[PDB]
RNA sequence: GAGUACGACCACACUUGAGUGAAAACACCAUAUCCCGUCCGAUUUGUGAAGUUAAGCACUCACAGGCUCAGUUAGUACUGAGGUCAGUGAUGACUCGGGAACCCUGAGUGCCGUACUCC
RNA sequence: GGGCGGCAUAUCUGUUACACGACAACGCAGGUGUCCUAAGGCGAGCUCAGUGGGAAUCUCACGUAGAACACAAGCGUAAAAGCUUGCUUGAUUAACGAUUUCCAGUACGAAUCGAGACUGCGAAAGCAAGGCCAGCGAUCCUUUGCGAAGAAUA
RNA sequence: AUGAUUAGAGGGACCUAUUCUCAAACUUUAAAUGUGCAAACAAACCGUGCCUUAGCCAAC
């Protein structure tokens, strides 16, 4: 059925900064993701994080680049039940920088959210119910496209 | 010291189990006019126009319809004296009450008994008194007694 | 000295010596004052007419009761 | 540690039937359904909107302790009887059901001829005439979930019924074209997006394209002729309203009775024993 | 025999697993020039129709859990009225009446309207 | 007993309290004289506390409210009564309308149902004259506001 | 459900199924005794009877 076929919805870059760190780092993300980010607040409210959320061909791409930057670097451990997986490359510079000296290098944490297509049904407004349980994507179908995309899942505990 | 508005209402202005909720649109859509008799009973998840808990559970008629609200008089004894208390709510906390359905029914029972003895129509056959003696035939006949089994069984351990 | 604050012991007995007289018919003191004042107002035109048209019909009975 | 155990099942009270599916906003429902109880009960009827991935349902209806009562529908399926055959879930569609619901339930209340509303869409808006000569049929806009944004279709269909003869209180805030910064609506965009010159234009830069639009282009929809169809089927509509599109056996299953049912058990629990 | 929209009562309707689904719907769905709204056409808004019942949804199943109605518990527990009743007493029975609850066990697993449409 | 102590002196929850209402103790466990231009009003979106999988706060599922609602408590509330946010001042005026609570069926304090004005929010139905229910005050005296202008042979 | 509480059993603690005991300020359930209202003469019923109304309703 043409209907399972797992496909990427999102992918969540996140920079956690914990002042002019906090925007050259916003700065940064917004030149690598075309995107404007939004700040977030922690819990006691200030600004703690940067974080952006990217779709379609462009979220895509960054994969690529993220997952040559790690080079097939995914533990087994790296995967969820949710079917969602991630993982943290630093210094962006890896992916094309330009290495303005007003903004240093900066770790970003790249996450990857996996998921079939007609989920729609959760989360519209009208009508919102539950996705069927054999519809979810999995920890192995999460392994099994992963390792058709770019490859190297070594078992790991820790 | 404590003589609250709402004091001692922690069992009487609270929701039965899994019956939580906003009243429903029937209530809405019933109508209430001047001279119904209505029963007053607080909806404890509306807390606007609720009665005081003396009035929980009494029955009064109508004096009053406003476009929110119901003005229900009702009885209340003080002293040697009965009060005719004019209280106002709001709609939710009333309902249609049912004080006079047996009654309604029996007029309603005499003009369908007039209207057939007018016609020369067959009245329904009369009840009869079950007071009043017969032969009884029996299907089966047991001896009622106590028997040993019953003060052995009746006691525990 | 300290004494007897409260007791309702012979209340009720009191309050029954002359009984507990009952409610006022509904047919009596019903008065509509304070009640929602367009009902009130569009009924006060009612009665106005009603008035009229039993002074008229008082005049018309003593008229009848002439003829005969 | 267990979530969804026993006790939770014991304390769970469900939502109403049609909460739960997702259908009804019963806070919402309950203000729409209310009235002055000085009224006594005289009738009250919502106009119902309720856009589906494919056709728009229009209903005038009463509520009723039994269940609501349905006095006249419309629906944007049965448009094509009126010409317009094509695009039946935008904006020109979701108007054009509105002004049939309007000219239906007025033929069907003896008061049409005497109610006409605007002959000639213009776009422009007018105040209702409500009690708040002889007053026009009253119906409130029902929504339901949908967002009401500025230029959403539900406001197409109350602007149809609006054109159409009804009293259906409202403000221009959300016609297509109302400029929240001015306070004022631009009747001439409503006059294009009601005719349907957007997606007019839409398949013009589609046919310049060279997967939508596709059965406008396996007919010869030209961009052109849009305009005037969805005018003519005004017309059409004002003509003639009771116009509808041209006209035992069971898939039921049998569930097994509670005997049957313990049959089956008791003879898995004998097959289970004698395996093992 | 079904579907959609609006519904009334609000689990016999819920939850968890599996299975089947005619037609028409419903929905997933495809897409962002315009109205409109987002960090993100995800949601939402607009325009659409290439595909799919994979999910939602509808029906079936479970010696399923809950729930509803019965029975059993039990004339038991408790209780209105009575005694110059018993007993040192705690209490208890008796006399004229009222009369439960849990555990457990049996059955059941939505129903009634308005309009419109498909077999 | 009085004194010392305390406040049971005005007053709010839960319990005492005996399945209508009422019900005492220097009975029990606690509150009150404030605080808020938003912590008031309305519309719209959203869902909380906690869990579990995953990324050198972010994510996906579960989640009957186990959170929150200024302050003690009880009650209530999940497309909200909570959180966020947008624009607002119904926290104004309101012809001596009626009513509840206390109760003598007197006031005071708090409430409830209204009628009119002028408005806020909302597409609309609607919802708001404060923050539900504790948070307060007679006579006399002092003190402030209202009785704009312009008209009338009266 | 909220709180208090003994012990084992299965996956030092955690969980899962229960088990020893129980609450004036806990409770799903739930009596007896109670407590409102009604039980035809200023009322109610029937007529789609007439008049009236700046009341409601799109009108009737
Ligand atoms: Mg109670
Ligand atoms: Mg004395
Ligand atoms: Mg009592
Ligand atoms: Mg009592
Ligand atoms: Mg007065
Ligand atoms: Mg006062
Ligand atoms: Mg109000
Ligand atoms: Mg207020
Ligand atoms: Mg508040
Ligand atoms: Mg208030
Ligand atoms: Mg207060
Ligand atoms: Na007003």
């Known amino acids: 059925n043409p209907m399972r076929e797992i496909v990427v919805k999102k992918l969540c870059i996140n920079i956690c900064v914990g002042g002019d760190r906090l925007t050259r780092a916003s700065k940064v993300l917004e030149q690598l993701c075309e995107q404007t980010p939004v700040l977030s607040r922690a819990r006691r409210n200030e600004k703690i994080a940067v974080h952006c959320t990217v779709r379609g061909k462009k979220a895509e791409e960054l994969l690529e680049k993220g997952l040559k930057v790690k080079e097939f670097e995914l533990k087994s451990y790296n995967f969820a039940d949710t079917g969602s997986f991630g993982f943290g490359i630093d210094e962006h510079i890896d992916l094309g920088i330009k290495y303005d000296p007003s903004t240093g290098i900066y770790g970003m944490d790249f996450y990857v959210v996996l998921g079939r297509r007609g989920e729609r049904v959760a989360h519209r407004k009208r009508k919102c119910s539950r996705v069927g349980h054999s519809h979810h994507v999995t920890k192995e179908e999460a392994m099994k496209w992963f390792e058709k995309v770019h490859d190297g899942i070594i078992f790991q505990a820790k | ?157 | 000295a300290k004494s007897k604050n409260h007791t309702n012991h012979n209340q009720s007995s009191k309050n029954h010596r002359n009984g507990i007289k009952g409610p006022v018919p509904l047919h009596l003191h019903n008065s509509k004052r304070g009640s929602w004042l367009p009902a009130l107002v569009n009924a006060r035109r009612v009665r106005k007419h009603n008035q009229k048209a039993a002074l008229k019909k008082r005049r018309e009975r003593i008229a009848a009761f002439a003829a005969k | 540690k267990v979530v969804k155990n026993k006790a939770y099942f014991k304390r769970f009270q469900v939502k109403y039937r049609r909460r739960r599916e997702g259908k009804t906003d019963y806070h919402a429902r309950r203000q729409m359904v209310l009235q002055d109880k000085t009224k006594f009960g005289s009738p009250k009827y919502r106009l119902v909107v309720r856009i589906t991935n494919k056709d728009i349902i229009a209903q005038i209806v009463q509520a009723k302790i039994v269940g609501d009562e349905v006095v006249m529908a419309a629906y944007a399926h049965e448009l094509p009887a009126f010409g317009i055959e094509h695009g039946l879930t935008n904006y020109a569609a979701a108007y054009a059901t509105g002004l049939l619901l309007a000219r239906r339930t007025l033929a069907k209340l003896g008061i049409a001829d005497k109610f006409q509303g605007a002959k000639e869409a213009d776009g422009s808006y007018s105040a209702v005439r409500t009690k708040k000569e002889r007053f026009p049929f009253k119906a409130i806009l029902d929504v339901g979930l949908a967002r009401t944004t500025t230029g959403a279709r539900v406001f197409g269909v109350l602007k149809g019924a609006v054109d159409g003869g009804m009293a259906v209180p409202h403000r221009p805030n959300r016609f297509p074209g109302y400029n929240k910064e001015k306070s004022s609506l631009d009747a001439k965009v409503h006059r294009d997006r009601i005719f349907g010159k957007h997606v007019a234009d839409y398949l013009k830069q589609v046919k310049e394209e060279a997967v939508q639009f596709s059965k406008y282009m396996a007919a010869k929809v030209l961009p052109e002729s849009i305009e005037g169809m969805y005018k003519k089927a005004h017309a059409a509509i004002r003509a003639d309203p009771s116009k509808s599109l041209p006209k035992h056996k069971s898939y039921k299953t049998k569930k097994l009775s509670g005997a049957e049912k313990r049959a089956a058990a008791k003879a898995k629990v004998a097959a289970i024993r004698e395996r093992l």
């Open chain 2, 1 to 157: 010291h404590s003589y609250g508005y709402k004091s001692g209402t922690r069992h009487l202005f609270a929701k039965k189990f899994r019956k939580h909720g906003v009243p429903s649109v029937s209530t809405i859509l019933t109508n209430i006019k001047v001279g119904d008799y209505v029963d007053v009973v607080a909806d404890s998840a509306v807390r606007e126009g609720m009665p005081h808990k003396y009035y929980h559970g009494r029955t009064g008629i109508v004096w009053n319809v406003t476009p929110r609200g119901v003005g229900v008089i009702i009885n209340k004894p003080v002293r040697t004296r009965t009060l005719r208390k004019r209280i106002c709510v709001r709609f939710e906390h009333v309902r249609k009450s049912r004080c006079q359905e047996a009654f309604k029914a029996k007029e309603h029972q005499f003009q369908a008994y007039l209207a057939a003895k007018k016609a020369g129509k067959a009245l329904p056959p009369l009840q009869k008194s079950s007071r009043l003696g017969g032969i009884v035939r029996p299907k089966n006949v047991e001896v009622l007694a106590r028997r040993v089994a019953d003060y052995e069984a009746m006691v525990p351990y």
